[PDB]
A paper describes a structure:
PCNA is a ring-shaped homotrimeric protein, with each subunit consisting of two domains connected by a flexible linker called the inter-domain connecting loop (IDCL). CAF-1 association with replicating DNA, and the targeting of newly synthesized histones to sites of DNA replication and repair requires its interaction with proliferating cell nuclear antigen (PCNA), the eukaryotic sliding clamp that acts as a processivity factor for polymerases during DNA synthesis. Recruitment of PCNA-interacting proteins to replication forks is generally mediated by a conserved sequence in these proteins called a PCNA-interacting protein (PIP) motif that interacts with PCNA in a region between the two domains on a single subunit near the IDCL. In this study, we focused on three separation-of-function amino acid substitutions in PCNA that cause defective gene silencing and exhibit reduced CAF-1 association with chromatin in vivo, as well as inhibit binding to CAF-1 in vitro partially or completely (D41A/D42A, R61A/D63A, and L126A/I128A).
The X-ray crystal structure of the L126A/I128A mutant PCNA protein was determined to a resolution of 1.93 Å. The L126A/I128A residues are located within the IDCL of PCNA, which is directly above the canonical PIP-interacting region. Compared to the wild-type structure, there are significant backbone changes in the structure of the L126A/I128A mutant PCNA in the IDCL. The α carbons of residues 123 to 129 have moved from 1.8 to 2.9 Å relative to their positions in the wild-type PCNA structure. Similarly, there are significant backbone changes in the structure of the mutant PCNA protein in loop B, which is more than 15 Å from the substitutions. Finally, there are significant backbone changes in the structure of the mutant PCNA protein in loop D, which is approximately 15 Å from the substitutions. The α carbons of residues 41 to 44 have moved from 1.5 to 2.7 Å relative to their positions in the wild-type PCNA structure. In the structure of the L126A/I128A mutant protein, we observe clear electron density in the vicinity of the IDCL, loop B, and loop D into which we modeled a portion of a PEG molecule and a chloride ion from the crystallization conditions. To our knowledge, binding of small molecule ligands at this site has not previously been observed with PCNA. Of the three mutant proteins crystallized, the L126A/I128A substitutions cause the most dramatic changes to this surface cavity compared to the wild-type protein.
Residue numbers in the entry:
A (entry chain A), B (entry chain A), C (entry chain A): 0 to 254
């Protein structure tokens, strides 16, 4: 076929879609020689979600020329929980397709499950949105980021992020009280993956909608770490990196 | 109580009502397990305004069974400017209520302000009016839409909208002269939120009353973007999307 | 100059960078009185790469005080294939440099090639990550390790390593079938360098991403042997030893 994109772990594609599905209905997947880009805005038209999966993330990848797969994510995710986790998953399609074929292959025995999913026609033009320089760049465990966001969103729909020298501060003020989380750059010798990194070019003081942050943290499924890039000028970028790809969320400050 | 619908930002409900109040006197709010729908027609009986706020727009939401709140918007908006902006706001009511309780809670200190607003009895049957397919769908910054409408309404009470391939054209002819605004689909790399999207299934050539467009643009308060859906057959739909909801305006072409 | 670090074989520094360049974009080289440490994480933020080159690896070494050289590896490797292999290579820099000078000297005739490479500003804090004790330590030919990894990665993105008494077992289960490699500690009398050594303090059963293992094996360029240290508690350590240095990869198990 024209496109044959083989994930060795179907669970990888399931975790990708879990990064999207709770805040996006429709997603266009543009498949190219160098891999797959998907983009979608959330129902409120405030959050841009951008996925890039390069050729090397796949066991085998072939796509001579572009193919656009407009998919309903509620449909795709009834079917994406059809792997075994252990299954491989190949996305298969032809030119200007009307359906996408999801081919699950068992990695224990002799079983194939071929699904054909009806595609939808979607606009669709894409934003490659990341700036050349940001005011501050940081990274931390995505489980730590998720907890901070879940915790403070209990208090307020607005979470203020402040970056100062060697200081990252999240703050929310609610009717039952207030929360302030201060994290400092820290390299963990025993478990480096839990480190916190900060590069500050200038201080940042920006407020974000917690309801959007609660969508963003579902990228946790893809990466144990999250990179955050902040700018007084441009939307904030929240990035969950895969092996040969990433899931990006762009979000303007509230003010 | 039977209904307890907690906005974490009272300003959110104020901005919702600001979308309505200048063209609608009376509004029935139907509260359900999945959130709130309000509907009203303007005094001239030409513009239908439809609001839907889902459960997730609220910090906390409970409504076992339907509750209908007929409110005078001039009254509701003397009281809706009683929050601090920083206040939370819970709408509270019981079965077949005669009043609605607006409970504002301070997010800095220990203060509660409980208002009880007398309700009015209103008909009231609701139209879920959006079609399955439209001729053309587009979205743009609501501030850009507002400016175009404010600018051209200075010239004429009729604004013609024409959709052709990759072209959106607004036109007005007045006694002091004429205006033509042409916008083209454009994805902005640095500030995606300012992008213009167009999906044309067939060309459109429709004229609308500028006085109604000037009511519609007050939805600007709720969303930085506006979706517009146009049809030779059905009313035009102008849509301002919230986090877990929307404000919709339906408007027939003038001819 | 402040730093003058002379490799007698430019090919040595080329082989070092080949250990990094396919999984890391940017690398900070910290130069000190006792030699050079470089550290970088891969694009997915899962693999930590740590290089240490001591003074004795160099024909001549001088560096009174720290110097940090942030280098783009794609740039450094267009230039690092500028030696003849037979050339010596001196890295030269001054205090808080903006460029690094690579001075290649011919070991046959009278020729010097001086390159000046623009440096990049990088965070950069470093993890000295190795634990005091691991559950199991082993070493084997790096070409044997590479083959096992290349072979099993054809089958699966997950390679399970199990250590039991006098037994090292690598296993992968794929859609076309499964592979199990069992190696046993063995001292080779004729070619000791090909021996396999195992020290087991407790049994190990850990699964690793094959895509990361495929990055790690490129350390083959530096050493004919690889040491592996495994722990139920800490990341796995894969180590390629030079004369007076090493290249280390730290990698958490998949589960
Ligand atoms: Mg598997
Ligand atoms: Mg607040
Ligand atoms: Mg030589």
């Amino acid at each position: 076929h024209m496109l044959e994109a083989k994930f060795e772990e179907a669970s990888l594609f399931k975790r990708i879609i879990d990064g999207f599905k709770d805040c996006v209905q429709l997603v266009n997947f543009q498949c190219k020689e160098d891999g797959i880009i998907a983009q979608a805005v959330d129902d409120s038209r405030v959050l841009l979600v951008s996925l890039e999966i390069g050729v090397e993330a796949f066991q085998e990848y072939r796509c001579d020329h572009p193919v656009t797969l407009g998919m309903d994510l509620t449909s795709l995710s009834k079917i994406l929980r059809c792997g075994n986790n252990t299954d491989t998953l190949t996305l298969i399609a032809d030119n200007t397709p009307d359906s996408i074929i999801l081919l699950f292959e068992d990695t224990k025995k002799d079983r194939i499950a071929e699904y054909s999913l009806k595609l939808m026609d979607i606009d669709a033009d894409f934003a490659k949105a990341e700036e050349l320089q940001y005011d501050s760049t940081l990274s931390l465990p995505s489980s730590e980021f998720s907890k901070i966001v879940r915790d403070l969103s209990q208090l307020s729909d607005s979470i203020n992020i402040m970056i100062t020298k060697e200081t990252i501060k999240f703050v929310a003020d609610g009717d039952i009280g207030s929360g302030s989380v201060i994290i400092k750059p820290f390299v963990d010798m025993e478990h480096p993956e839990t480190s916190i990194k900060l590069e500050m070019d200038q201080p940042v003081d920006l407020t974000f909608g917690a309801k959007y942050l609660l969508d963003i943290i579902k990228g946790s499924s893809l990466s144990d770490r999250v990179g955050i890039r902040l700018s007084s000028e441009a939307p904030a970028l929240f990035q969950f990196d895969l092996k040969s790809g990433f899931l990006q969320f762009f979000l303007a400050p509230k003010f």
